[PDB]
Design a protein around this nucleic acid. Structure first.
Ligand SMILES: [Mg+2]
Ligand SMILES: [Mg+2]
Ligand SMILES: [Mg+2]
Ligand SMILES: [Mg+2]
Ligand SMILES: [Mg+2]
Ligand SMILES: [Mg+2]
Ligand SMILES: [Mg+2]
Ligand SMILES: [Mg+2]
Ligand SMILES: [Mg+2]
Ligand SMILES: [Mg+2]
Ligand SMILES: [Mg+2]
Ligand SMILES: [Mg+2]
Ligand SMILES: [Mg+2]
Ligand SMILES: [Zn+2]
Lengths: 193, 64, 140, 103, 39, 135, 77
RNA sequence: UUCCGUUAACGAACGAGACCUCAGCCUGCUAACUAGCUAUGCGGAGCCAUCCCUCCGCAGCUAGCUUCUUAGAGGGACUAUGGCCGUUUAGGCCACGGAAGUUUGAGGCAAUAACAGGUCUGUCAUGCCCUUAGAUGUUCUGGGCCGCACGCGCGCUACACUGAUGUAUUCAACGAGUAUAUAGCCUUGGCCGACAGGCCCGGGUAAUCUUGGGAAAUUUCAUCGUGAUGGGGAUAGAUCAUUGCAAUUGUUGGUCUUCAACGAGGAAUGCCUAGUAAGCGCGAGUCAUCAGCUCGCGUUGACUACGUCCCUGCCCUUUGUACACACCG
């Protein structure tokens, strides 16, 4: 897709390939519509259903960094964490940091879950599929929480807790909060099939 | 050994479950574009979305 | 005769970008545009310029006075002031169909470099200390 | 001969005050006076919130009373009698006129 | 040593703008004074 | 000049300038004061007094008619009151007044008619000359 | 990581981080950051935050400064 | 219970809607030196410097000045146009356009019938009863409403590094100023003072002065380094200053010192769907002094859902009742 516009004016959006065609529809990265200079846009997302699938993904990651009250709405701080984070990713991997995140989104999103449904008149938790958009939403959620928990009461910085999280998650090692939370969800859901 | 198979939501049926938390959909298998079976999705899902399925034999019943 | 005074708005930040037919100047309350002081939200102010080009501005100068709002709202404001002020100058002084190209550059990127957000601070109502939030309820 | 006489108008009523305001303007425009008006001033809004109950019981409910106040100004380059020769038309109920001699 | 100009009550008094009305006698005379409840 | 240069990196230059621009007087209360009611510790830096000067020598350059009761506000900040909610707190005027006194004696600022403190004709020069001496 | 409790133990200023170890601690992923070194080596900060300058004046690496005291590190070249 | 329609009913009345108020668009209109760009005159500086180029201050018959501000008029949206759905009716979903397509947003008003709901302590509103000079009347002094084994509710501050502190940097909005006495409510500017607070000249009954309210979080740059630490700030000791006729059971604001519980909180449980939740501060009420409160304001600004009747309740229909102070029967 055409356009030589880059995040923070350093990182190319071309040469990022999202493998799983399942959620290629909701990773707002690949098309030239989604390229943006900054992960900060005051777009009126959430206004309609599925509209937040159009929000550029690096912003969706950014939005989730602002939690637990003392971080709510502090988006300049949150985005600044993102810049340092991708500095560290290219520092440690020397690959496209955009590729790392979107591969970290794709490896750490549960494909199944258990919900309390009732067939025949009696309810209990039963195994179900997961829609792609909640899967992306869940993949973001796991990564950001895991980076958050480790940084707390740690000399380590959040930018680099986030960075270790994403590198390990994109590899797929059983080392991330996101990875272990993903697989326990699948294992439960598998059992209650 | 199950192989993760992909399907596409052709259409949406209802919102089952006690709390309504389960959209029931009809899926289209991509390996064989002939198998239209019911599945139960969690999360917002429209036609043209692609569901990852671990198993396939698990088939949802009507108004499940 | 090139002179246009086109504004842009965000929540309360209002920016007015007076223009003359110069060489390259872009100054916000007299200070260079290259220096506005969210240095993370600096690309947002620069966003119209990297969209069109420094070349498109080769015969105009910009003095973009701002008032009100906050920090972030102003950067989204100057964005429209720069973006809108260009097309108004182009509409009035260059060509009407040489700005159709310019507009579709701005519009295919973001729709809010020409048209503001109507969103505003919803009033507080009693029975709670927020727009929607209500005081915590206790039964026993 | 030609002074700076300012007429100040306040009221609680939008429609009523602009009846007088425009009449004064058209009053003196028929004399081809130097009439510099009306300068329209920020509306003041007096406010009281009071609890609706006389006993402090029930869901605490508040009523916001308020009052709009509108402020109008006219400039006339004229005399102390030309100002009064004009400003003798029927002042509509309640509208406040306080013409004074400016600097 | 400040009471309502209407009833002489010592509580809930409104000195704002110099009404010196209690919160109840004012409500009773509010529209007459000219405080419109627009909202 | 002043506005083309970073309002931070420049003041480092002007803080290194009032060191070596000859010298002036300096209080025998300088190293103890917290500069505000709400501060917790006195300024960390030893050569803070000239940085406060350099930072406040641009105020009159970029404004006019600032008294001491307004200079207190410019450097005030939030105040944490422990248990009770935090508020705004106005900083101290002894520090602010005296910085003016020194630069008055040195020909960067003067007392202003119509009230306030106004920049000098020739003080504008150096704040623009040293401005030119910044990257 | 008693790494401000360790800032004066003579091993440090003798050699400990004057390439005694910190050749390696970037080389784990070849330029691992000033703070990954700060915890991939069990020792933490401010014996390091002084030496983040010290190795910089020694011309072995190039470094950054910013908001959160994010700071970076490089091995060679 | 809004309509299409149905029809032993026909034709009407209330409620709903309409309505009313602020917000969202108006380079179109009336303007505006108590709002203000724009140009030009000069004045200060930088600099290829003499002029020009840039930032600045001061005045005017500068404007074929009103873009920015105020406040009046009116304009604009009506599901209008297109598509699929539907008794192809009423209406539904979507799409280009548009400031705007949940009635665009949020509020004000708001039916019949009731409750032994609260209020006789708001009202010289009020029946009956009690007392009425040794008073349950009034007035003054002092004390109490604040007392502390304990249980409960709304909250403030935290348990830290997405941070504390100390620099530097700088962006709002809503309101407010009773002869306030001899400056006086809001208080600019000068000087004294480490803070606190004083002395002085004054401005404003206010788009004119305070104040274009230079707000905080934030943004930078250092210092700290996983340690009940420099997190946190209860408790207490000493002193100073202000308000008031009076500060004691510390009115409050300072300075030094003291450095507690608290390591994210069990069973339970509240509020909340986009400028929203959450964070941040400001103004107003009370007010001589005191705001951890309430009513408003702006600033940064999301996650999630676009559903269901499962829990808690509400409306309509059908049905059962030995209930009618009505299932708490
Ligand atoms: Mg940490
Ligand atoms: Mg706070
Ligand atoms: Mg409505
Ligand atoms: Mg009563
Ligand atoms: Mg009590
Ligand atoms: Mg309450
Ligand atoms: Mg502290
Ligand atoms: Mg700070
Ligand atoms: Mg108060
Ligand atoms: Mg709903
Ligand atoms: Mg039966
Ligand atoms: Mg009976
Ligand atoms: Mg029973
Ligand atoms: Zn009364």
């Amino acid at each position: 897709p055409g356009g030589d516009v880059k995040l923070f004016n350093r990182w190319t959006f071309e040469d990022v390939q999202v493998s799983d065609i399942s959620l290629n529809d909701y990773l707002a990265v690949t098309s030239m519509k989604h390229y943006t200079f900054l992960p900060h846009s005051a777009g009126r997302y959430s206004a309609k259903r599925f509209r937040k699938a159009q929000c550029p993904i690096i912003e969706r990651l950014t939005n989730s960094l602002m939690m637990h009250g003392r971080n709510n709405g502090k988006k300049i701080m949150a985005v600044r964490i993102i810049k340092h984070t991708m500095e560290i990713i290219h520092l440690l991997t020397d690959a496209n940091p955009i590729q790392i995140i979107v591969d970290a989104i794709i490896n750490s999103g549960p494909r199944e879950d258990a919900t309390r449904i009732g067939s025949a008149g009696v309810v209990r938790r039963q195994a179900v599929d997961i829609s792609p958009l909640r899967r992306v939403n869940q993949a973001i959620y796991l990564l950001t929480t895991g980076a958050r928990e480790s940084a707390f009461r740690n000399v380590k910085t959040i930018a680099e807790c986030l960075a270790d999280e994403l590198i390990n998650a994109a590899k797929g090692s059983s080392n991330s909060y996101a990875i272990k939370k993903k697989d326990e969800i699948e294992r439960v859901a598998k059992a209650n099939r | 050994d199950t192989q993760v198979k992909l399907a596409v939501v052709v259409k949406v049926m209802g919102r089952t479950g006690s709390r309504g938390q389960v959209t029931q959909v009809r899926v289209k298998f991509l390996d064989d574009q002939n198998r239209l079976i019911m599945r139960n999705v969690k999360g917002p899902v429209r036609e043209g979305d692609i569901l990852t399925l671990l198993e396939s034999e698990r088939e949802a019943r009507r108004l499940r | 005769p090139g002179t246009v005074q086109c504004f842009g708005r965000k929540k309360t930040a209002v920016a007015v970008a007076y223009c003359k037919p110069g060489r390259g100047l872009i100054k916000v309350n007299g200070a260079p545009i290259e220096l506005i002081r969210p240095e993370m939200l600096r690309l947002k102010a620069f966003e119209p310029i990297l969209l069109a080009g420094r070349s498109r501005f080769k015969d105009i100068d910009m003095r973009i006075r701002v008032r009100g709002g906050g920090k972030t709202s102003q950067i989204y404001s100057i964005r429209q002031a720069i973006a809108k002020s260009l097309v108004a100058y182009y509409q009035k002084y260059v060509d009407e169909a040489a700005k159709k190209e310019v507009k579709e550059i701005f519009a295919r990127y973001d729709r809010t470099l020409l048209v503001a957000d109507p969103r505003r601070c919803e009033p507080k109502k009693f029975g709670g200390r927020g727009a929607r939030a209500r005081f915590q309820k206790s039964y026993r | 001969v030609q002074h700076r006489i300012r007429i100040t108008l306040s009221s609680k009523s939008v429609k009523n005050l602009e009846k007088v305001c425009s009449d004064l303007v058209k009053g003196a425009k028929e004399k081809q006076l130097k009439v510099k008006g009306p300068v329209r001033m920020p509306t003041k809004v007096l406010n009281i919130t009071t609890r609706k109950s006389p006993c402090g019981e029930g869901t605490n409910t508040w009523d916001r009373f308020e009052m709009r106040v509108h402020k109008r100004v006219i400039d006339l380059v004229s005399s102390p009698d030309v100002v009064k020769q004009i400003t003798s038309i029927t002042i509509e109920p309640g509208v406040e006129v306080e013409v004074t001699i400016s600097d | 040593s400040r009471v309502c100009r209407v009833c002489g009550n010592s509580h809930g008094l409104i000195r704002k703008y110099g009404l010196m009305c209690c919160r109840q006698c004012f409500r009773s005379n509010a529209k007459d004074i000219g405080f419109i409840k627009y909202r | 000049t002043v506005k083309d240069v970073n309002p931070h990196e420049f003041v480092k230059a002007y803080s290194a300038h009032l060191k070596r621009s000859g010298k002036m007087e300096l209080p025998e209360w300088v190293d103890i004061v917290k500069t505000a009611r709400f501060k917790e510790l006195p300024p960390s830096d030893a050569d803070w007094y000239y940085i406060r000067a350099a930072s406040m020598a641009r105020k009159i350059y970029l404004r006019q008619g600032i008294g001491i009761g307004g200079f207190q506000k410019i450097y005030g900040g939030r105040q944490r009151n422990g248990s009770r909610p935090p508020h705004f707190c106005k900083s101290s005027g002894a520090v602010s007044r005296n910085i003016l006194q020194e630069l008055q004696k040195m020909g960067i600022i003067d007392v202003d008619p119509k009230g306030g403190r106004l920049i000098t004709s020739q003080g504008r020069r150096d704040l623009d000359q040293v401005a030119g001496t910044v990257p | 990581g008693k790494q401000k409790e360790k800032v004066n133990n003579a091993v440090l200023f003798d050699q400990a981080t004057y390439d005694k170890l910190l050749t390696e601690v970037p080389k784990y992923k070849q330029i691992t950051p000033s703070v990954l070194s700060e915890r991939l080596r069990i020792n933490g900060s401010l014996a390091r935050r002084a030496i983040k300058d010290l190795m910089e004046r020694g011309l072995i690496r190039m470094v950054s400064i910013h908001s959160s005291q994010q700071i970076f590190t490089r091995a060679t070249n």
